[PDB]
């Protein structure tokens, strides 16, 4: 997250931290995700496309810090890693950039709700807030495009939804953005999601309800003028989410 503020998990208690164990034992951070039901974390396919093997991954809920434990956290193996069949990531834009991870602890349990672990509501179909609405994004991603390190502490910021009309402009993204994607940015381009934030939540208040409106997907650089963050439009993937969460 470029700019914004530091936060803790009780301000995004659905946020999932996803790691991969390497052949050799070393664990590195992959992407964020969102707990949408006790056994299901939702994220982005591009986080996993090159390493689609479910055994490689570890998921944490209730974690506020990247490389140290948070009291009350829960660690999970990935029982099932479901990627979207129609994903495509030639061109800059990633299409159908959505993934599901069924979570299971060593003891065979899913998520137990607590002060630091709760679920997030999905939007009703094709129901998104109007452009210029302020939404929040969360993640352990870079604080600067040039950084080598990820922050140790979870971060959050606010960005505003951009119309498809505005985002399809040549001086923005042209034809790369589709109607199954949402653009969102800061008016001054001073704050944004960035590398490491992918898969994480774009959360909007939709009828006085917290809603998983988007999933951090792609962008050209971070917090660059005329280059918004691009997010998977969750309200356009509900049938896909419904069927696959029975797997």
């Amino acid at each position: 997250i470029i700019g914004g503020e530091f936060t803790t998990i009780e301000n995004q208690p659905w946020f999932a931290a996803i790691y991969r164990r390497h052949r050799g034992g070393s664990v590195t951070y992959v992407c964020g995700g969102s707990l949408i039901s006790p056994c299901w974390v939702i994220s982005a396919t591009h986080c996993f496309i090159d390493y689609p093997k479910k055994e490689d991954y570890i998921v944490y809920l209730g974690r506020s810090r990247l490389n140290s434990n948070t009291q009350g956290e829960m660690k999970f193996e990935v029982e099932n890693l479901i990627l979207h069949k129609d994903y495509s990531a030639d061109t800059l834009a990633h299409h159908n950039d959505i993934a599901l991870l069924k979570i299971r602890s060593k003891e065979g349990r899913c998520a137990q709700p607590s002060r630091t672990i709760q679920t997030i509501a999905l939007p009703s179909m094709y129901n998104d807030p109007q452009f210029g609405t302020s939404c929040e994004i969360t993640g352990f991603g870079k604080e600067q495009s040039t950084d080598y390190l990820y922050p140790e502490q979870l971060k959050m910021t606010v960005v505003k939804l951009i119309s498809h009309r505005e985002c399809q402009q040549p001086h923005y993204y042209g034809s790369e953005v589709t109607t199954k994607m949402l653009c969102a940015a800061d008016p001054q381009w001073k704050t944004d999601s960035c590398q490491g934030d992918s898969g994480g939540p774009l959360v909007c208040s939709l009828q006085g309800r917290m809603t998983l409106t988007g999933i951090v997907s792609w962008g050209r650089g971070c917090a660059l003028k005329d280059k918004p963050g691009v997010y998977t439009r969750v309200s356009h993937f509900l049938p896909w989410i419904r069927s696959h969460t029975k797997e």
Binding site: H46, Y51, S193, S217, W218, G219, C222
Partner: peptide, 15 residues
């Protein structure tokens, strides 16, 4: 910049 520093290219073989 360089695509391997962007959202979209996390956890990728060529990065």
């Amino acid at each position: 910049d360089g695509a391997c520093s962007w959202r979209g290219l996390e956890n990728h073989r060529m990065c």
